[PDB]
Nucleic acid binder design. Structure first.
Lengths: 485, 231, 50
DNA sequence: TTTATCCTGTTAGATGGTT
DNA sequence: ACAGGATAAA
C-alpha cells in the first residue's frame, strides 16, 4: 500500500476481482476554483490547479528593438508598461507595471520642494523604490546642472560666477548644457563640483533687498521682487556672488501638481469564492525626499506611478503567477491576470506489480467548480487482482502498509477420516510427511482451515526452523513477499 | 594557514584600500617632487663622481637636513602607496594572459614593474584617471615579459611581430580566396622569400621535452661522439 | 550578443576521399558550419552569417 | 647597403583565479 | 600590439 493509503475493508471481508481495497484521498488545502489541464493527448488530467481573476482592462504585446513589452491600455485611455514578464511569480508588494509618463521627467538636476504633498514614513530601505505619497500637492522644481569631477585646478576655463552660454568647455573635455551662472567648488587646488544655474541675473544695488534674499526665496507671478522688478512667473530669487560682487538670480521654478489619489482606474477581482482577494493597487512614489539637492547632468524621473500586487492579510506569503487571458468575446484582446495557482498532481494508473493491484484515480470535482478548503479532490482506489479473503491488516496507531489476500488456489482439500483425526483443530500447523492418522500421512504442509466430514481444508504453508540466538528481521503476523530476509 | 601562494598574494593585496582621484592627484604631486629631487641628486652624482651625502644633498636644495629628509620620505611613501593601491589593477590586467608561457605569478610581478613605471610617469596636470595611463604600461610590461621569458630558445620581439603579421595575412588571404593559401601566395603577399617564411615557421616551434611518452623520448636519442668502432 | 543557431549546423562534403586520405596519409573529415547572429542590444543591427 | 636586435613610449575607464 | 629611433652585425 502506498503512503497515506487507507484500506476500505476489514479483516475477513471476501472481495472480488477489481473491488476497491485501499484508497488515497487528495484534498485541496485552501480551496478556490478548479482548473483542469487540457487533454494533451491524455484523457486523464495528471495535474489540476487551484485558483481570483481580474480582467477589466486591455493588453497588447508590442515589439520594440526586439523586446516584447506589454502595454496595458485602461478603459480610461491610460497606458502602462508591463515590467514583469509572463511566467514570473511575484509576491505582495512587488511592482508589476509602470505608468508610461513623461510630465514628471526633468531635463536636468536641481532642487525639490514640497507644498502640501505628504508621503508614508514606513521604511528607509524602500528609498531606492521611492516614497509612497499619502496626500497629493505641489512639487516645486528648481533647475540646475551639476558637473561633479575630481580634477585638478589648472584644467579650468571659466571664472567663478561667470555668466556663460551652453556649450562652453567649462572644464577640459566637459561641456555645459544650460545657459546660466557658473559656481565653482575647489579643494586644495582640485576641482570638485561645478554648478550652472539658469534664470535671469540682475544687479544688487540695495543691501537690504539682498539681506531679504540672503537665504533665497520664492516669488510669485506679478509680485514685485524689488522696486522696479516684478516676477512675471513664479521664480526662485537668491543672492549670488558673481565676478563683480552681489547679484540676484531669478531661477525659473517649475510646478508639478500631483492629485491626492492616483486617477488610474483599478481593476476589480471578480470571484467571491476566494476568501483572500488579490488586486492591483496603483501607488505614486517620489524618488527623492523634501529639499533633496540633486546633482545630475541628465534628466531624472521624479514621480513614478506603479501597479503593486496587494492581497488580504494572512495571504502575504502567497506568490502569484502572471498570465494572459484571451477574452471570451474577443480572443484577440488579452487581459492581464494574477493567479495564486496551487497544484495537485495525479499519478498515472499503474497495475503492474507496484501495488500488485490496479490503481485508478478518479476526480471528485469538475473544471471551474468552486471548492472549500479540505474538500476531497481525487480518490485513488486500488483494485485487487484475485478474489479471496483480506487479512494481515492490524488495527491501531499504525499506517496499513501491506495487506494479504488468500485466494482460491491457496487452499487444498484432502480426503481424511474424521473419526480418528479428532486430535486436530482448525488452525493447527501440520508438518508434511507427518502421520496424521494410523496409515494416514500428511501429503503437504499447511494451516488447518476446516474439518468437514471426510475432508480437510489446508491453507498452503511452509515452515522455517530458527535456532536460539538468531536475529529476527520480521514480526509475528507480519507480511512478507518473495525474497524478503 | 593556506598553502596556496597566489591566494596569499591576493589576500595581501586586499588589505589595501583603493585610492580616490583626489588622492591620486596629491600623490602625483608628491611623486613629481620626489622625481625632481632625485634628478638633482643625480646631477650631484655627476659632479662628485660619488653618491652625495644627505648633508651635501640637503645643501644642494638650500633646505634644512630635517625638512629635506622628511620631504624625501613623504615622496617615497607617496610612490609606495600609488603602486600598492593599484596592484589590484595589475592583477586584473595580468589575468588575461595566463596561458601564454608565463605563470600567473610571473605575469603579476612583471606587470608590477609596468605599474611602477606608470606611477613614475603619471601627469596629474593631464587631467586623466591613473587607471587609464597605468593600463598601457602594465600591458606593455607583461607583453614584453612574455616575449622575453616564455620560451627556452628565446625569440626577439620583431620575430613575434613577424609571426603575428604572417598569421593575419594568412587569415586575410583565406577569407578573400575562400581557401587555404599556399606558401608561394603568402610569400608574395608578405613580400618575402619562401625560404624566409620556412625559416620563420621552423623557428616558431616549441621545444619538445625529453620526457615525452613514446618509455620516454630521452631514451631514443643517440649521443654525439666517435663510435668505438670508428676510432 | 552572439547566438549560435546550432540546430541548423550544416556539414560540408569531405574533401579527397576515404581511399585518397589513406594513400595520401591525411585525415578523413568534414567541415562544420553553424549559422550565427550577432545582435546589438541597442542599435539592433543583426549581421546573420555562417 | 640592409636588415637583426634593442630601447622607449601609449592618456575614456577599467582594480582579487580555474581547475 | 604598434610606432618611432639608434646601432651594429651580417
Amino acid at each position: 500500500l502506498l503512503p497515506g493509503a487507507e484500506p476500505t475493508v476489514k479483516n475477513g471481508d471476501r472481495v472480488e476481482v477489481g473491488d476497491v481495497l485501499a484508497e488515497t484521498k487528495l484534498t485541496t488545502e485552501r480551496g478556490g476554483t478548479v482548473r483542469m489541464g487540457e487533454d494533451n493527448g491524455s484523457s486523464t488530467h495528471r495535474e489540476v490547479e487551484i485558483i481570483v481573476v481580474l480582467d477589466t482592462a486591455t493588453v497588447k504585446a508590442e515589439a520594440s528593438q526586439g523586446r516584447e513589452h506589454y502595454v496595458i491600455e485602461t478603459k480610461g485611455g491610460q497606458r502602462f508598461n508591463l515590467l514583469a514578464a509572463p511566467g514570473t511569480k511575484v509576491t505582495t508588494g512587488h511592482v508589476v507595471a509602470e505608468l508610461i509618463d513623461s510630465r514628471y521627467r526633468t531635463q536636468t538636476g536641481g532642487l525639490l520642494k514640497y507644498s502640501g504633498v505628504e508621503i508614508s514614513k514606513k521604511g528607509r530601505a524602500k528609498a531606492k523604490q521611492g516614497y509612497e505619497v499619502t496626500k497629493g500637492g505641489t512639487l516645486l522644481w528648481i533647475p540646475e546642472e551639476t558637473h561633479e569631477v575630481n580634477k585638478d585646478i589648472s584644467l579650468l576655463n571659466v571664472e567663478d560666477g561667470q555668466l556663460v552660454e551652453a556649450g562652453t568647455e567649462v572644464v577640459k573635455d566637459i561641456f555645459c548644457q544650460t545657459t546660466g551662472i557658473v559656481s565653482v567648488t575647489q579643494n586644495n587646488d582640485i576641482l570638485r563640483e561645478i554648478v550652472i544655474k539658469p534664470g535671469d541675473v540682475h544687479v544688487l544695488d540695495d543691501p537690504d533687498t539682498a539681506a531679504k534674499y540672503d537665504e533665497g526665496r520664492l516669488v510669485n507671478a506679478g509680485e514685485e521682487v524689488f522696486p522696479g522688478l516684478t516676477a512675471e512667473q513664479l521664480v526662485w530669487a537668491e543672492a549670488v556672488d558673481g565676478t563683480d560682487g552681489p547679484l540676484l538670480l531669478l531661477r525659473p521654478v517649475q510646478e508639478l501638481v500631483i492629485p491626492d489619489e492616483p486617477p488610474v482606474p483599478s481593476q476589480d477581482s471578480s470571484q467571491e469564492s476566494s476568501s483572500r482577494s488579490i488586486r492591483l493597487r496603483a501607488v505614486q512614489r517620489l524618488q527623492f525626499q523634501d529639499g533633496e539637492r540633486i546633482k545630475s547632468v541628465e534628466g531624472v524621473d521624479l514621480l513614478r506611478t506603479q501597479l503593486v500586487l496587494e492581497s488580504e492579510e494572512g495571504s502575504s506569503q502567497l506568490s502569484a503567477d502572471i498570465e494572459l487571458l484571451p477574452d471570451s468575446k474577443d480572443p484577440e484582446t488579452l487581459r492581464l491576470q494574477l493567479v495564486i495557482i496551487e497544484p495537485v498532481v495525479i499519478r498515472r494508473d499503474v497495475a503492474s506489480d507496484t501495488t500488485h493491484g490496479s490503481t485508478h484515480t478518479e476526480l471528485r470535482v469538475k473544471d471551474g467548480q468552486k471548492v472549500k478548503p479540505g474538500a476531497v479532490i481525487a480518490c485513488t482506489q486500488i483494485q485487487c487482482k484475485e478474489a479471496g479473503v483480506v487479512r494481515g491488516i492490524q488495527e491501531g496507531s499504525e499506517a496499513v502498509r501491506r495487506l494479504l489476500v488468500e485466494r482460491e488456489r491457496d487452499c487444498v482439500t484432502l480426503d481424511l477420516d474424521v473419526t480418528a483425526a479428532t486430535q486436530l483443530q482448525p488452525g493447527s500447523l501440520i508438518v508434511a510427511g507427518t502421520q496424521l492418522v494410523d496409515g494416514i500421512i500428511a501429503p503437504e504442509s499447511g494451516e488447518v482451515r476446516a474439518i468437514a466430514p471426510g475432508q480437510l481444508q489446508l491453507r498452503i504453508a511452509r515452515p522455517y526452523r530458527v535456532s536460539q540466538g538468531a536475529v529476527l528481521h520480521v514480526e509475528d503476523k507480519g507480511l512478507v513477499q518473495r525474497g524478503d530476509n | 594557514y593556506t598553502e596556496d601562494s597566489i591566494r596569499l598574494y591576493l589576500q595581501e593585496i586586499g588589505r589595501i584600500r583603493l585610492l580616490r582621484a583626489d588622492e591620486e592627484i596629491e600623490l602625483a604631486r608628491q611623486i613629481a617632487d620626489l622625481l625632481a629631487l632625485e634628478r638633482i641628486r643625480d646631477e650631484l652624482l655627476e659632479q662628485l663622481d660619488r653618491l652625495p651625502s644627505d648633508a651635501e644633498w640637503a645643501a644642494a636644495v638650500d633646505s634644512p637636513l630635517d625638512e629635506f629628509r622628511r620631504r624625501l620620505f613623504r615622496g617615497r611613501r607617496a610612490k609606495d602607496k600609488m603602486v600598492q593601491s593599484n596592484l589590484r589593477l595589475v592583477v586584473s590586467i595580468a589575468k588575461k594572459y595566463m596561458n601564454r608561457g608565463l605563470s600567473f605569478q610571473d605575469l603579476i610581478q612583471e606587470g608590477s614593474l609596468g605599474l611602477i613605471r606608470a606611477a613614475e610617469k603619471f601627469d596629474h596636470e593631464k587631467g586623466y584617471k591613473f587607471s587609464t595611463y597605468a593600463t598601457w604600461w602594465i600591458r606593455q610590461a607583461i607583453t614584453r615579459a612574455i616575449a622575453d621569458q616564455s620560451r627556452t630558445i628565446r625569440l626577439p620581439v620583431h620575430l613575434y611581430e613577424t609571426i603575428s603579421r604572417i598569421k593575419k595575412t594568412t587569415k586575410l588571404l583565406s577569407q578573400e580566396m575562400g581557401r587555404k593559401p599556399t606558401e608561394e601566395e603568402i610569400a608574395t603577399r608578405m613580400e618575402m622569400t619562401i625560404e624566409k617564411l620556412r625559416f620563420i615557421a621552423k623557428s616558431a616551434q616549441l621545444p619538445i621535452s625529453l620526457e615525452t611518452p613514446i618509455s620516454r623520448l630521452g631514451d631514443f636519442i643517440e649521443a654525439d661522439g666517435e663510435t668505438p668502432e670508428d676510432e | 550578443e552572439l547566438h549560435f543557431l546550432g540546430k541548423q549546423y550544416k556539414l560540408k562534403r569531405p574533401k579527397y576521399d576515404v581511399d585518397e586520405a589513406k594513400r595520401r596519409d591525411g585525415t578523413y573529415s568534414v567541415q562544420m558550419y553553424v549559422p550565427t547572429r550577432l545582435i546589438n542590444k541597442e542599435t539592433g543591427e543583426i549581421k546573420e552569417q555562417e
